[model samples]
Target: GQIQVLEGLEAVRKRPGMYIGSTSERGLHHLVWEIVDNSIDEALAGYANQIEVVIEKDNWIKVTDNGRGIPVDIQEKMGRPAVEVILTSSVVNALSQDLEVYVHRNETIYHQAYKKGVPQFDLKEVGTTDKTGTVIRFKADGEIFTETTVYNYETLQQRIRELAFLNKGIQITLRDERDEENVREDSYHYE
Candidate 1:
């Protein structure tokens, strides 16, 4: 049995667990997997060698990587604007399925949200960075999964460490900015 992966909100929301593991702590991180794996693709493709993730305040998860940015040109067929045309990642809709807002980046940081594949607000540029890459920032939707709101950083660390061990020299940093725990900051790199 198989299903279409990226059909929009309803398709995935109906079986969120089928698409993104379970809706538990494991699943919460899986929500993150749908995201960070994109960056991992960049590194594995030899475009980016470094990636970082910061669990910021209010439980916002930020994943940044040094990789190729999305297209900045407009779509000729659809006649959509550049920002609208930048919806290539699966995580965009996945985040929406959770009813959470996020920011995506390419040439500019697009801080916006969408309901079902429709834009909740006009996606606009917030700032620019040094190199080309993506910035994914979003908080988990407590409404969707009422079990818990905490993401086990230790599990994430192990997962990142696994990535490091699997891909040598591919550095991945998972840090927490929500608390005063010095141990929350860790960088995984193996050669």
Candidate 2:
């Protein structure tokens, strides 16, 4: 006979696989797809056209887009302020050991960072006159995964290319800045 209760974020960190698949390369890169799907929602909603993804050296994949950036309103879930289906603590806790959501809208930029499920600081605004978009970058939390911390460029491109072809017109640029190769700037755009 066994009855155990996992609490709050611990409930998530305990059985991460139940929340976001397995904590391997599969899980590690699923984090990227999790955020990309958010931007695709904007595109699906007819607000976004271009999405950019960069695989960096420091266990980071930056996904950015040109859309009506996520609303900075307070959320019931993770102090996470985006659409209910889009931004959940389960997803964030699955993806972020450290994470940043940089949302550019109208004439201002709203920024927030969370480190290991804790807010780095309160959400703050920085003024900017650039096009509207959201940039999400995260470091995989080993505290939650079985193995795998690094992201592969070509594999990401393979998956991202599928998104472009499927989504249609949601241009996706897969950039690898970890090194210099022909893969430096390959873009996928479709109608």
Candidate 3:
């Protein structure tokens, strides 16, 4: 045996079990929870009132929140956009096959995309927005989760309902768009 060291995201890919528990269905779902938890934190801090999760075709997940967008200003130490730094360090980003983020702040919208924790391109101003918030979409890496990557609507619904009740005021919505012929959506808000 010998001592060994691995870089951050690389380590994540090498031993995903250490960060997410295991590469089973449970682990796949855990990715969603991590992303949602970030939105919940914004609500906990009173900056967000609504959060939405969409299960798109191909089993992709999109989570959007009405909260202060991730800081997009340059980070002096890292010399990168704060949003880029925040996402590149995210375990969710490290495990996803592809991930994209849109930040609405300072009356402008910023966009960035990444692949397996690597930035596909630098952050860029895409458009303008009156409201401020964040939107993230990701597809779990099938290579890491060999068992399955498909998401269960009911499974997500149950937890979203529970988180809404637990938080008491933050509205959480779940929409299933995997089937265009039969779309389903639910909103949970506890007062």
Candidate 4:
């Protein structure tokens, strides 16, 4: 028997199925769900009322939540901005080829981007904002998902509808923009 240790993101990429079922279509959809679940957590905590998912050009998924954004304060343990630490370790971020985070907090907008769970640069204030929330955008890693990189709208719509119905009062919106000529959108809300 051999004992092997792999660091964080590398470990995730090497054995993606262990973290995200299979590296097939189902696993590709799981990436979006992982980020959505985080937003749902905010909704469960009563801090978020709206969640938006967009299947952007090239199958990039963008999820936004109206909740308290990830704190940008420096983390004492990691010696990095809290948001950087949080995103770097996120399963979604780890598996994506490119991921970007925009956090609106403390009347400021903080932005950072990561490639395969590695931060490209330090998180910095990008602008000023009165709203408080978090926006995450990621492109699924084609190398990991060799079967398909495209996302099916119906698959996402079904789950978004279910989540809104189960949660009650929270509004979940799904938008498909993969086709530049034709765009579709749906909102799932249950009271």
Candidate 5:
């Protein structure tokens, strides 16, 4: 079959849901998975392991891995940093914008997702430092979802437990903000 490639970041934004699901709460989490998948890809390619994710007090999410970091050199097409190319130009931006819109809304419906104890955070590679990993941090739009801005730890723990069983060796950790008992802090490790 002939190959079809989508071009430009604009195209992605126009159909963000198609690429990453709706800007709703689910899509927000999907963004994290997409970035994590990149780390997984590196592992599959025999690059590195041990990916870490952190949710800060400001609701910013951070993901770090010890794999060959995304290429930071300039790209011939846009002449921008390769990290930018992978982040903004790639499918992640579509996912990011969708999640941002939902967070911006932070309506009651959106809050319900959080009330259910769901976790939400955005992902982005740190910079062109060639450090061999990525760290993403985005504020969780507390105003979204139908329920309260509280996270259900047991729910998240169960979910991560399942993932751990499926992935084998990959470790997942969760931690909550000091003031927000409902908030969570988590991480994952693989050998």
Candidate 6:
């Protein structure tokens, strides 16, 4: 099969379902995975070793990484902060809510580029660290899902258990804000 390179982050928004499978509940949650994948990518590059995810009240979800933080320097042509440019652009705007405005202003700058003949950019930094990493928080749209809005602690725990089993020695933890009393923790080792 021939390979096709997507130009800017807009590609994800323009065709979100294609990349995430659907704009439904499953797809909305998939956005979290996409952001988490960046940290995983950093781990693969030997820059990150630990990651954290928190689901907050009001449908807000936060993902943080211990990898290198995004660069905050200014770009030549854009003259704007590299991180700012990327965050404000139409691409990141697709999945994220307006709250991201504060994140862009305080976090990093963005760099200018092209995507399918259109000028574009992306987030240059994640958190407040000098190390390169990312932290993405988005409020799931109400219209996307009809089921439960809060994350299922047991379901997430089960998924993490399976993941740890699949990759021996890899530490993974799932914490649910909904249940603080009966949180279950388990580990797996292959014989």
Please give, for residues 3-113, the per-residue lDDT of candidate 3 as tens digits: 121166788998998999999999999999999999999999999999999999999999999999999998886788999888888889989999999999999999999
Model 4: which ten-residue window has the lowest total lDDT?
Answer: 1-10
For model 1, what is the C-alpha lDDT against the true structure?
A: 0.66
Lowest summed lDDT over 10 consecutive residues: which window, candidate 5? Answer: 103-112
Give the Cα lDDT of each candidate: 0.66, 0.74, 0.93, 0.90, 0.46, 0.50
lDDT per residue for candidate 6 within 29-125, as digits (tens), equals 6655666555666666776665566666565666666566544567785665544445444333455542242232233422333322233434333
lDDT of 2 by residue, 82-101 (tens): 53223335465434788777
- Report the poorest 10 consecutive residues by lDDT, candidate 1: 1-10
lDDT of 5 at 13: 53
Candidate 4 residues 1-191, lDDT tens each? 00121277778999999999999999999998899999999999999999999999989999999999988998777777888877877878888899999999999999999899888887988899999999999999998999998998999999999999999989999999999899999998898
lDDT per residue (tens digit) for residues 93-137 in model 1: 554432323333454654555444455566566776557776666
TM per candidate comes to 0.78, 0.84, 0.96, 0.96, 0.59, 0.59
* Global fold similarity of model 6 (TM-score): 0.59
List the candidate 4 regions with Cα displacement exceeding 4 Å. Answer: 1-6
Clashing pairs in 1: none
* Candidate with more favorable, higher TM-score: 1 or 3: 3
Q: Which candidate comes out best when scored by lDDT?
A: 3
Q: Output the lDDT of residue 26, model 4.
A: 98
TM-score of 2: 0.84
Model 3 Cα shift for residue 146 (angstroms): 0.6
Model 5 local distance difference test score: 0.46
**Order of the predicted models by lDDT, top scorer first:** 3, 4, 2, 1, 6, 5
